[PDB]
Tab-separated table of C-alpha atoms in Angstrom:
chain	number	residue	atom	x	y	z
A	2	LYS	CA	22.074	-0.811	42.292
A	3	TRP	CA	21.180	-4.033	44.164
A	4	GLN	CA	22.130	-5.414	41.613
A	5	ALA	CA	18.800	-4.211	40.202
A	6	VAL	CA	19.126	-2.773	36.698
A	7	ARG	CA	16.518	-5.327	35.516
A	8	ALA	CA	17.754	-8.158	33.306
A	9	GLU	CA	16.468	-8.066	29.705
A	10	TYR	CA	17.220	-9.762	26.374
A	11	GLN	CA	16.573	-8.973	22.658
A	12	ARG	CA	13.272	-9.428	20.753
A	13	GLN	CA	12.514	-10.475	17.143
A	14	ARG	CA	12.968	-7.205	15.214
A	15	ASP	CA	15.715	-5.843	17.493
A	16	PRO	CA	17.684	-8.925	16.449
A	17	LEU	CA	16.411	-8.365	12.917
A	18	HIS	CA	17.714	-4.787	13.148
A	19	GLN	CA	21.295	-6.067	13.214
A	20	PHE	CA	21.882	-3.218	10.852
A	21	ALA	CA	23.717	-0.570	11.919
A	27	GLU	CA	29.393	-2.159	6.238
A	28	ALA	CA	27.269	-0.802	4.639
A	29	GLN	CA	26.991	-1.667	0.902
A	30	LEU	CA	25.428	-5.142	0.817
A	31	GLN	CA	26.255	-6.808	-2.438
A	32	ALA	CA	26.087	-9.730	-0.005
A	33	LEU	CA	22.273	-10.024	0.105
A	34	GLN	CA	21.979	-9.552	-3.686
A	35	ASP	CA	24.854	-11.919	-4.551
A	36	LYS	CA	23.262	-14.613	-2.374
A	37	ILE	CA	19.983	-14.087	-4.306
A	38	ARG	CA	21.753	-14.419	-7.672
A	39	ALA	CA	23.407	-17.561	-6.247
A	40	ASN	CA	20.023	-18.988	-5.193
A	41	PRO	CA	16.811	-17.348	-6.494
A	42	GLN	CA	13.981	-19.702	-5.338
A	43	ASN	CA	14.632	-19.171	-1.630
A	44	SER	CA	11.705	-17.446	0.151
A	45	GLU	CA	13.557	-16.151	3.222
A	46	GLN	CA	16.373	-14.652	1.068
A	47	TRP	CA	13.920	-12.277	-0.631
A	48	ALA	CA	12.346	-11.523	2.749
A	49	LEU	CA	15.765	-10.458	4.077
A	50	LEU	CA	16.135	-8.155	1.069
A	51	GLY	CA	12.656	-6.763	1.873
A	52	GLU	CA	13.839	-6.251	5.435
A	53	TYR	CA	17.017	-4.392	4.332
A	54	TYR	CA	15.049	-2.026	2.102
A	55	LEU	CA	12.460	-1.417	4.844
A	56	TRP	CA	15.314	-0.359	7.195
A	57	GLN	CA	16.556	2.030	4.464
A	58	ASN	CA	12.917	3.200	4.139
A	59	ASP	CA	12.946	2.234	0.468
A	60	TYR	CA	9.337	1.169	0.515
A	61	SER	CA	9.025	0.515	-3.265
A	62	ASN	CA	12.017	-1.831	-3.294
A	63	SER	CA	10.957	-3.396	-0.010
A	64	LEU	CA	7.529	-4.194	-1.478
A	65	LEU	CA	9.088	-5.757	-4.571
A	66	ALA	CA	11.343	-8.026	-2.496
A	67	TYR	CA	8.569	-9.072	-0.115
A	68	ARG	CA	6.193	-9.705	-3.016
A	69	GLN	CA	8.693	-12.126	-4.524
A	70	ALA	CA	9.237	-13.857	-1.161
A	71	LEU	CA	5.438	-14.361	-0.955
A	72	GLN	CA	5.111	-15.554	-4.577
A	73	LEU	CA	7.538	-18.335	-3.744
A	74	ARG	CA	6.245	-19.317	-0.266
A	75	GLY	CA	2.505	-19.057	-0.810
A	76	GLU	CA	0.242	-17.557	1.834
A	77	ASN	CA	2.285	-16.969	4.986
A	78	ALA	CA	1.396	-14.877	8.026
A	79	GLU	CA	4.894	-13.371	8.722
A	80	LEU	CA	5.155	-12.210	5.127
A	81	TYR	CA	1.605	-10.873	5.079
A	82	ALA	CA	2.482	-8.903	8.267
A	83	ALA	CA	5.728	-7.603	6.721
A	84	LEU	CA	3.951	-6.428	3.566
A	85	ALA	CA	1.429	-4.697	5.834
A	86	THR	CA	4.241	-3.060	7.741
A	87	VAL	CA	5.757	-1.725	4.441
A	88	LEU	CA	2.398	-0.502	3.118
A	89	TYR	CA	1.587	1.219	6.441
A	90	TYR	CA	4.940	3.011	6.565
A	91	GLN	CA	4.701	3.880	2.880
A	92	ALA	CA	1.386	5.571	3.664
A	93	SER	CA	3.096	7.605	6.427
A	94	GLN	CA	1.692	5.392	9.209
A	95	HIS	CA	-1.902	5.759	8.092
A	96	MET	CA	-4.185	2.744	7.625
A	97	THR	CA	-5.019	1.911	4.085
A	98	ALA	CA	-7.243	-0.682	2.408
A	99	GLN	CA	-4.138	-2.533	1.078
A	100	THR	CA	-2.644	-2.440	4.575
A	101	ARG	CA	-5.742	-3.774	6.317
A	102	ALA	CA	-6.117	-6.647	3.854
A	103	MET	CA	-2.492	-7.793	4.358
A	104	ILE	CA	-3.169	-7.684	8.145
A	105	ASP	CA	-6.410	-9.642	7.740
A	106	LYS	CA	-4.658	-12.238	5.625
A	107	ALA	CA	-1.826	-12.499	8.210
A	108	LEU	CA	-4.253	-13.036	11.071
A	109	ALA	CA	-6.181	-15.681	9.178
A	110	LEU	CA	-3.061	-17.797	9.018
A	111	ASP	CA	-1.913	-17.022	12.577
A	112	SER	CA	-4.288	-15.349	15.013
A	113	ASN	CA	-1.314	-14.420	17.228
A	114	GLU	CA	1.011	-12.901	14.611
A	115	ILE	CA	2.555	-10.166	16.754
A	116	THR	CA	3.756	-7.949	13.949
A	117	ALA	CA	0.165	-7.733	12.675
A	118	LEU	CA	-1.316	-7.327	16.193
A	119	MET	CA	1.111	-4.534	17.001
A	120	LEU	CA	0.279	-2.596	13.805
A	121	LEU	CA	-3.443	-2.960	14.599
A	122	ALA	CA	-3.000	-1.804	18.248
A	123	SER	CA	-0.934	1.230	17.337
A	124	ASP	CA	-3.299	2.270	14.609
A	125	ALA	CA	-6.340	1.896	16.942
A	126	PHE	CA	-4.430	4.217	19.325
A	127	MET	CA	-3.842	6.783	16.563
A	128	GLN	CA	-7.575	6.678	15.639
A	129	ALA	CA	-8.525	7.127	19.348
A	130	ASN	CA	-10.028	3.668	19.654
A	131	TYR	CA	-8.163	3.192	22.936
A	132	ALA	CA	-10.323	0.338	24.135
A	133	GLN	CA	-9.350	-1.628	21.027
A	134	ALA	CA	-5.694	-0.635	21.381
A	135	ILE	CA	-5.649	-1.785	25.031
A	136	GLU	CA	-7.419	-5.055	24.158
A	137	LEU	CA	-4.838	-5.790	21.442
A	138	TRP	CA	-1.815	-4.821	23.584
A	139	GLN	CA	-3.235	-7.020	26.361
A	140	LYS	CA	-3.758	-9.921	23.897
A	141	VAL	CA	-0.039	-9.555	22.953
A	142	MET	CA	1.019	-9.273	26.612
A	143	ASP	CA	-1.018	-12.442	27.296
A	144	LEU	CA	1.137	-14.250	24.759
A	145	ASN	CA	4.125	-14.132	27.158
A	146	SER	CA	6.328	-13.677	24.071
A	147	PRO	CA	10.061	-12.860	24.144
A	148	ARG	CA	9.246	-10.639	21.187
A	149	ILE	CA	7.868	-7.497	22.796
A	150	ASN	CA	9.322	-5.641	25.773
A	151	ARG	CA	6.552	-6.107	28.378
A	152	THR	CA	7.168	-2.746	30.064
A	153	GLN	CA	6.522	-1.175	26.665
A	154	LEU	CA	3.077	-2.825	26.458
A	155	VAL	CA	2.240	-1.750	30.019
A	156	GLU	CA	3.304	1.834	29.197
A	157	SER	CA	1.393	1.929	25.891
A	158	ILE	CA	-1.742	0.637	27.731
A	159	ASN	CA	-1.412	3.200	30.538
A	160	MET	CA	-1.130	6.037	27.939
A	161	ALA	CA	-4.260	4.783	26.152
A	162	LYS	CA	-6.000	4.746	29.550
A	163	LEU	CA	-4.934	8.367	30.297
A	164	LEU	CA	-6.038	9.469	26.819
A	165	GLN	CA	-9.376	7.653	27.175
A	166	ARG	CA	-10.085	9.475	30.473
A	167	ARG	CA	-9.250	12.872	28.940
A	168	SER	CA	-11.598	12.124	26.028
A	169	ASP	CA	-14.324	11.022	28.404
A	170	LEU	CA	-13.813	14.229	30.361
A	171	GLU	CA	-13.695	16.577	27.353
A	172	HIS	CA	-16.860	15.083	25.827
A	173	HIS	CA	-18.569	14.472	29.099
A	174	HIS	CA	-18.663	10.873	27.969
A	175	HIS	CA	-17.952	8.962	31.221
A	176	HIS	CA	-19.621	5.634	30.336
A	177	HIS	CA	-18.792	2.984	27.743
B	2	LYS	CA	-10.878	-27.094	-23.566
B	3	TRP	CA	-7.933	-28.987	-22.007
B	4	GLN	CA	-8.859	-27.667	-19.416
B	5	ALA	CA	-7.266	-24.544	-20.907
B	6	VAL	CA	-9.409	-21.437	-20.453
B	7	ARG	CA	-6.440	-19.778	-18.682
B	8	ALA	CA	-6.767	-19.229	-14.929
B	9	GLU	CA	-6.990	-15.571	-13.845
B	10	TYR	CA	-7.862	-13.574	-10.714
B	11	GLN	CA	-8.975	-9.968	-9.950
B	12	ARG	CA	-6.741	-6.845	-9.828
B	13	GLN	CA	-6.821	-3.708	-7.626
B	14	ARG	CA	-9.456	-1.546	-9.349
B	15	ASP	CA	-11.577	-4.486	-10.560
B	16	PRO	CA	-11.959	-5.339	-6.872
B	17	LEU	CA	-12.400	-1.625	-6.216
B	18	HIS	CA	-15.150	-1.604	-8.864
B	19	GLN	CA	-17.345	-3.768	-6.641
B	20	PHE	CA	-19.941	-1.347	-7.765
B	21	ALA	CA	-22.483	-2.635	-9.916
B	27	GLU	CA	-28.109	-1.030	-4.107
B	28	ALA	CA	-27.621	1.688	-5.237
B	29	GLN	CA	-28.222	4.725	-2.962
B	30	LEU	CA	-25.273	4.741	-0.553
B	31	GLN	CA	-26.188	6.638	2.557
B	32	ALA	CA	-23.795	3.987	3.861
B	33	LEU	CA	-20.555	5.723	2.775
B	34	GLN	CA	-21.815	9.145	3.946
B	35	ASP	CA	-23.228	7.863	7.266
B	36	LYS	CA	-19.884	6.191	8.025
B	37	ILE	CA	-18.168	9.564	7.340
B	38	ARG	CA	-20.551	11.400	9.689
B	39	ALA	CA	-19.829	8.638	12.238
B	40	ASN	CA	-16.061	9.100	11.837
B	41	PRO	CA	-14.742	12.174	9.966
B	42	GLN	CA	-10.921	12.054	10.465
B	43	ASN	CA	-10.456	8.772	8.607
B	44	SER	CA	-8.376	9.152	5.407
B	45	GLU	CA	-9.494	5.984	3.602
B	46	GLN	CA	-13.212	6.741	4.237
B	47	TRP	CA	-12.997	9.955	2.183
B	48	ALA	CA	-10.981	8.110	-0.465
B	49	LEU	CA	-13.798	5.551	-0.781
B	50	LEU	CA	-16.244	8.427	-1.247
B	51	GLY	CA	-13.916	9.832	-3.924
B	52	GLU	CA	-13.897	6.405	-5.525
B	53	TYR	CA	-17.737	6.181	-5.525
B	54	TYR	CA	-18.065	9.586	-7.178
B	55	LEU	CA	-15.384	8.763	-9.760
B	56	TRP	CA	-17.426	5.642	-10.731
B	57	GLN	CA	-20.508	7.868	-11.101
B	58	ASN	CA	-18.275	10.214	-13.154
B	59	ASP	CA	-19.073	13.040	-10.725
B	60	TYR	CA	-15.631	14.539	-11.041
B	61	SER	CA	-16.337	17.677	-8.956
B	62	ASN	CA	-17.564	15.643	-5.979
B	63	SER	CA	-14.827	13.066	-6.470
B	64	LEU	CA	-12.171	15.796	-6.317
B	65	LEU	CA	-13.690	17.199	-3.123
B	66	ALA	CA	-13.672	13.813	-1.399
B	67	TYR	CA	-10.137	12.960	-2.499
B	68	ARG	CA	-8.868	16.401	-1.500
B	69	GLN	CA	-10.178	15.840	2.024
B	70	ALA	CA	-8.633	12.349	2.157
B	71	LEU	CA	-5.277	13.962	1.232
B	72	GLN	CA	-5.632	16.849	3.710
B	73	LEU	CA	-5.911	14.264	6.470
B	74	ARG	CA	-3.225	11.774	5.322
B	75	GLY	CA	-0.547	14.140	4.092
B	76	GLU	CA	1.394	13.431	0.920
B	77	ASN	CA	0.518	9.933	-0.270
B	78	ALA	CA	1.210	8.365	-3.659
B	79	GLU	CA	-2.090	6.392	-4.022
B	80	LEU	CA	-4.093	9.547	-3.342
B	81	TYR	CA	-1.923	11.683	-5.612
B	82	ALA	CA	-2.553	9.058	-8.343
B	83	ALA	CA	-6.316	9.038	-7.667
B	84	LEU	CA	-6.536	12.830	-7.856
B	85	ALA	CA	-4.605	12.623	-11.130
B	86	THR	CA	-7.068	10.038	-12.410
B	87	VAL	CA	-10.046	12.347	-11.561
B	88	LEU	CA	-8.375	15.407	-13.126
B	89	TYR	CA	-7.452	13.473	-16.297
B	90	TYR	CA	-11.002	12.134	-16.722
B	91	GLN	CA	-12.489	15.530	-15.883
B	92	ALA	CA	-10.406	16.914	-18.761
B	93	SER	CA	-11.857	14.268	-21.116
B	94	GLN	CA	-8.703	12.107	-20.962
B	95	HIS	CA	-6.391	14.924	-21.974
B	96	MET	CA	-3.222	15.719	-20.002
B	97	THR	CA	-3.325	18.889	-18.038
B	98	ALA	CA	-0.819	20.757	-15.878
B	99	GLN	CA	-2.822	19.879	-12.712
B	100	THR	CA	-2.890	16.263	-13.844
B	101	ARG	CA	0.824	16.000	-14.540
B	102	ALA	CA	1.722	17.559	-11.179
B	103	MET	CA	-0.419	15.058	-9.231
B	104	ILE	CA	1.325	12.264	-11.223
B	105	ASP	CA	4.765	13.732	-10.487
B	106	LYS	CA	3.951	14.002	-6.810
B	107	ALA	CA	2.674	10.380	-6.790
B	108	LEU	CA	5.827	9.063	-8.403
B	109	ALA	CA	8.062	10.973	-6.006
B	110	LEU	CA	6.590	9.047	-3.132
B	111	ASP	CA	6.456	5.700	-4.984
B	112	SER	CA	8.332	5.259	-8.241
B	113	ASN	CA	6.225	2.150	-8.983
B	114	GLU	CA	2.749	3.546	-8.331
B	115	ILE	CA	0.884	1.650	-11.051
B	116	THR	CA	-2.139	3.927	-11.248
B	117	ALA	CA	0.227	6.824	-12.090
B	118	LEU	CA	2.360	4.726	-14.474
B	119	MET	CA	-0.711	3.510	-16.300
B	120	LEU	CA	-2.037	7.050	-16.808
B	121	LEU	CA	1.372	8.147	-18.078
B	122	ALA	CA	1.664	5.197	-20.529
B	123	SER	CA	-1.807	5.640	-21.964
B	124	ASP	CA	-1.357	9.352	-22.412
B	125	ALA	CA	2.021	8.843	-24.145
B	126	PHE	CA	0.145	6.463	-26.477
B	127	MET	CA	-2.519	9.069	-27.214
B	128	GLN	CA	0.212	11.677	-27.977
B	129	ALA	CA	1.996	9.173	-30.287
B	130	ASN	CA	5.040	8.818	-28.053
B	131	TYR	CA	4.862	5.056	-28.480
B	132	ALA	CA	8.392	4.439	-27.329
B	133	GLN	CA	7.542	6.060	-23.988
B	134	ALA	CA	4.251	4.179	-23.766
B	135	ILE	CA	6.039	0.847	-24.411
B	136	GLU	CA	8.789	1.661	-21.874
B	137	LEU	CA	6.166	2.478	-19.206
B	138	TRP	CA	3.979	-0.578	-19.942
B	139	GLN	CA	7.152	-2.709	-19.815
B	140	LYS	CA	8.151	-1.096	-16.489
B	141	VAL	CA	4.691	-2.081	-15.136
B	142	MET	CA	4.938	-5.592	-16.632
B	143	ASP	CA	8.381	-5.906	-14.979
B	144	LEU	CA	6.702	-5.308	-11.620
B	145	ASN	CA	5.049	-8.763	-11.763
B	146	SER	CA	2.032	-7.174	-10.081
B	147	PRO	CA	-1.329	-8.898	-9.541
B	148	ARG	CA	-2.778	-5.496	-10.354
B	149	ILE	CA	-2.687	-5.398	-14.143
B	150	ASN	CA	-3.792	-8.147	-16.512
B	151	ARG	CA	-0.455	-9.024	-18.204
B	152	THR	CA	-2.085	-9.940	-21.530
B	153	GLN	CA	-3.458	-6.402	-21.558
B	154	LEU	CA	0.046	-4.924	-21.244
B	155	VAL	CA	1.357	-7.232	-23.988
B	156	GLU	CA	-1.530	-6.205	-26.273
B	157	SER	CA	-1.159	-2.480	-25.518
B	158	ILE	CA	2.606	-2.753	-26.309
B	159	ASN	CA	2.002	-4.629	-29.584
B	160	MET	CA	-0.520	-1.921	-30.690
B	161	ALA	CA	2.030	0.812	-29.900
B	162	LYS	CA	4.556	-1.178	-31.945
B	163	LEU	CA	2.165	-1.437	-34.931
B	164	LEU	CA	1.328	2.266	-34.692
B	165	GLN	CA	5.004	3.192	-34.422
B	166	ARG	CA	5.811	1.261	-37.666
B	167	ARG	CA	2.914	2.922	-39.530
B	168	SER	CA	4.196	6.325	-38.426
B	169	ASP	CA	7.740	5.431	-39.485
B	170	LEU	CA	6.373	4.327	-42.838
B	171	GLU	CA	4.088	7.333	-43.420
B	172	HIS	CA	6.855	9.834	-42.560
B	173	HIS	CA	9.666	7.841	-44.072
B	174	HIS	CA	11.154	7.948	-40.592
B	175	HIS	CA	12.584	4.424	-40.199
B	176	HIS	CA	15.279	5.186	-37.580
B	177	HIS	CA	15.092	6.295	-33.960
């Protein structure tokens, strides 16, 4: 060491993934106790998303959003559920939830990170890079910065290989 | 008025029916531009379905599904094409696409609405009602709720008439 292990803290879904009890009457009971609370339904949506119960996640998030009105974080969460439900393939429903999110908050990271990753999967590396750089530029405690650097360097490597295989060296 | 005309918004196939140009090189050109995109082939399938070109619709949707892998919305769309191709009669191909849809998403409304309507046409009103109620219970912006109420009341009327004609008053 030096010490040099590199200091690092949590994020905003690593904290949110404070699952791994496990039967949570808790979250439901607290909803029966108080039913008009936005963030309580969002937490239910979050639990179901972790369980990969996309149908039930969508229902809970939908209710959250009914109560709160238009809200970027909830638009981005819906988009996350839809995207995963479609096996991590973009979808018209997914893109519209993302577009609604970004209209309320141009720097909503959850939405930006879904867009980046999907650009990468569709080989639009230049868009992926641009988006991961936009996020990096936010200096946010939310995303591990070494992850962004690494994702960008992979997109760069894959761009070059594409350029080389297609003899497409310009842009 | 009051004003009392009753406020109401779109759905998810009323927006999708943003047909009624009309020659759409557009959709084809965009496929030639990018051929590995799932939702682009689905949109082609959707165009052809609107034209009632069931053969071409099936081809486009099949390709969409080849690319995306199992996906409830596309299973439900296939089932819609097959059902309409068979003049709105259930079919083994149709039921299997519906069963695949509902295995990926137990609340896929397109599949639920085909099942309900077909139950109605086969005089299984109790099943139709149960399905239309399940949809209603989803509190979804997708289906006009007054339509579900009306469809359920018709099934109720037709049930009673059947009970009366057959002297079958129990269930």
